[PDB]
Design a protein around this ligand. Structure first.
Ligand code: ATP
Ligand code: ADP
Ligand code: MG
Lengths: 592, 91
């Protein structure tokens, strides 16, 4: 077996030395593999399956069963050798060196009849030999494989089996494929229980049953691009390594949750008292940037609290909101404040300007070009951003200004929490928060009465009439099935005088930051703030006229004074009021 | 890079399976200022000049605010290096 040991590895010998991990719950696959192996004409099984489902584990379990335990006749005391296929190619510069090695190995195998070959990554068997004068391994092996003179096992995934094996139909017909399916949750739990002993021995730690259950569940639920056994094993191994480096050591659920949260960024770690207190005061924290609009803040806080408390539906996004209201009331400001509260700032928001989706053929910007078209390899734009950041806030600004078909693509997002790009990959949306802003049904806020005679008048305030108008326009513009999937529809009322007075402080603070960027500052008196609030206030146009008034009445004078030289670094400006009645004006005084 | 990871490394799922991805995020402004403070010694030694703290702060802030085609740690260092070269050639 010297020639076999030179270009291969003895799996049965390794299994006799307990160098292979145990295999749990693969009796059916091993039985079918043995049944195919004990054939007469084409006894060559190939295991095709997704990467990480345990294809090599089946062969290792078969080797362990051969070494110890019961196997059917014609398989007693058979040596299973893994042919690396990389040593044969190496060192074969001269013509007819690979062929000589292959023929020698085959002759030895035929002489010593208790040999079973295992060739991992069988797709590499095609074209093993180089160009010029050389006979590839597949053509050499074809006659023996056809007649049943060489028992062999292969293992590939579906992609290269359909991509390489099926190209050579003649070689493909000599192998009987066996599907290896990804295990379910209890089977993964059993596998984790089996491997717990080895992983505890290696990491010198202790792992609880709840740790295994949590690892399996979290890996199944939150990781998308991998497969269950590998995900659970990776979680357990990384948690064990983290606890070992920290230093009897014990691994439990919260360590697994922390590891998963650090890996993916989705908040799943165990709730602490400080974080619970912070979540219970979400409205107060959000109101530091948004004045008024209490209902929308309550809705957002309720959604976030429900998501963090563990009562979220695991098949739908965290929340879906339609913020409908007039201009300049705080629809986008609330989204920016929510993003800043959540991650670290308003720059982490995923914002789409639906003014660019005016034509119905622009929807490809969400998916990507279909196969055979320019830009197909680039993929989608929204899908990639969501895939690279599973926990994020997605905002659709001015939804009514896009074609009323793009949102047909949001259905599966709002109900199944998933989206498929043109390449067939599924990207989940189950951890995102969807916000759609609009001003539909707000064109009649500055309306006094309706056409026709009427006694008395409408006792309902502007809020009720505008709410009814928004509901009617929403039903008119969108399909019933789209509106049936939206969690909340929040109507934004207009701002009052006190709200403007409060927003004055925030705007002045922003101006003060701009000035302090050049080592300066600005301070206003109460009379100045009251005058600014009185001058800029329009119930229809929101708080943008206040910004224009502030800029016109403050920034122009400040720029004129700075350019002239009265205001210089190291000085601050104090703004006061002079005059009375409608002749009141502002006065600026320098001060160190 | 993310684009190279998606375009090329994901065409071989078997190879991609055997790696654990780690996200390296773009540093914030204070982190960039600390990095500039750390590399000030080497850049002063190479360029044979002296750099003030205000120069580092201005470089970081201006690179973050005005230049938007690249990412923070590199584009901030580029301004310092260009200024050093411009000052060096004047001798
Ligand atoms: N409730 C508010 N609290 C604080 N500032 C506000 C509020 N509403 C408006 N503002 C100020 O007005 C600016 C413009 O408002 P914003 O961008 O939120 O409008 P919007 O409701 O999205 O309306 P539009 O329909 O024009 O997009 C904000 O950046 C902020 O400075
Ligand atoms: N039935 C099983 N019992 C125990 N462990 C398993 C089983 N199936 C897979 N594994 C584990 O999964 C890990 C990776 O599986 P692997 O053999 O790489 O699958 P593939 O060859 O299809 O990529 C291995 O370390 C193995 O321990
Ligand atoms: Mg807006």
């Amino acid at each position: 077996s010297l020639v076999l040991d030179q270009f291969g590895r003895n799996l049965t010998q390794a299994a006799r030395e307990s160098k292979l991990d145990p295999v749990i719950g693969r009796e059916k696959e091993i039985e079918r593999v043995m049944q195919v192996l004990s054939r007469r004409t084409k006894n060559n099984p190939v295991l095709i399956g997704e990467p990480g489902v345990g294809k090599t584990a089946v062969v290792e379990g078969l080797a362990q069963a051969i070494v110890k335990g019961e196997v059917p006749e014609t398989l007693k005391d058979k040596h299973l050798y893994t042919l690396d296929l990389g040593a044969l190619v190496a060192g074969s510069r001269y013509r007819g060196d690979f062929e000589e090695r292959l023929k020698k190995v085959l002759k030895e195998i035929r002489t010593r009849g208790d040999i079973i070959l295992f060739i991992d990554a069988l797709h590499t068997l095609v074209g093993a030999g180089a160009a010029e004068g050389a006979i590839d391994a597949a053509s050499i092996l074809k006659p023996m494989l056809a007649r049943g003179e060489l028992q062999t096992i292969g293992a590939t995934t579906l992609d290269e089996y359909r991509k390489h094996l099926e190209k050579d139909a003649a070689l493909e017909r000599r192998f009987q494929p066996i599907q290896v399916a990804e295990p379910s949750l209890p089977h993964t739990i059993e596998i984790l229980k089996g491997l717990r002993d080895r992983y505890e021995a290696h990491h010198r730690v202790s792992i609880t049953d709840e740790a295994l259950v949590q690892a399996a569940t979290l890996a199944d639920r939150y990781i998308s691009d991998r497969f269950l056994p590998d995900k659970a094993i990776d979680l357990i191994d990384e948690a064990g390594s983290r606890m070992r480096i920290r230093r009897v050591a014990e691994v439990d659920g919260e360590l697994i949750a922390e590891v998963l949260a650090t890996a993916t960024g989705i908040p799943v770690f165990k709730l602490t008292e400080e974080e619970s207190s912070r979540l219970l005061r979400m409205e107060d924290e959000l109101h530091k940037r948004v004045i008024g609009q209490v209902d929308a803040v309550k809705a957002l806080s309720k959604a976030i609290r429900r998501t963090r408390a563990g009562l979220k539906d695991p098949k739908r996004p965290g929340g879906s909101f339609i913020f409908a209201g007039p201009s300049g009331v705080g629809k986008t400001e609330l989204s920016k404040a929510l993003a800043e509260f959540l991650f670290g700032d308003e720059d982490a928001l995923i914002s789409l300007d639906m003014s660019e989706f005016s034509e119905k053929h622009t929807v490809s910007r969400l998916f990507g070009s279909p196969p055979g078209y320019v830009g197909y390899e680039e993929g989608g734009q929204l899908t990639e951003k969501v895939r690279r950041k599973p926990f994020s806030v997605v905002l659709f600004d001015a939804v009514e200004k896009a074609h009323p078909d793009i949102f047909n693509s949001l259905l599966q997002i709002l109900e199944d929490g998933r989206l498929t790009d043109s390449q067939g990959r599924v990207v989940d949306f189950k951890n995102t928060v969807i916000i759609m802003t609009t001003n539909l049904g707000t064109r009649d806020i500055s309306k006094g009465f309706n056409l026709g005679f009427a006694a008395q008048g409408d006792t309902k305030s502007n809020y009720e009439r505008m709410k009814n108008k928004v509901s009617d326009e929403l039903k008119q513009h969108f399909r019933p099935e789209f509106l049936n999937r939206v969690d909340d529809v929040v109507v934004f009322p207009q701002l009052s005088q006190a709200d403007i007075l409060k927003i004055v402080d925030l705007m002045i603070d922003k101006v003060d930051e701009r000035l302090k960027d050049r080592d300066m500052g600005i301070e206003l008196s109460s009379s100045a703030k009251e005058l600014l609030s009185k001058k800029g206030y329009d119930p229809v146009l929101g708080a943008r006229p206040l910004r224009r008034t502030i800029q016109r009445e403050i920034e122009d004078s400040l720029s004129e004074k700075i350019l002239f030289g009265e205001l210089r670094p190291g000085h601050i400006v104090v703004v006061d009021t002079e005059g009375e009645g409608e002749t009141k004006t502002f006065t600026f005084r320098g001060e160190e």
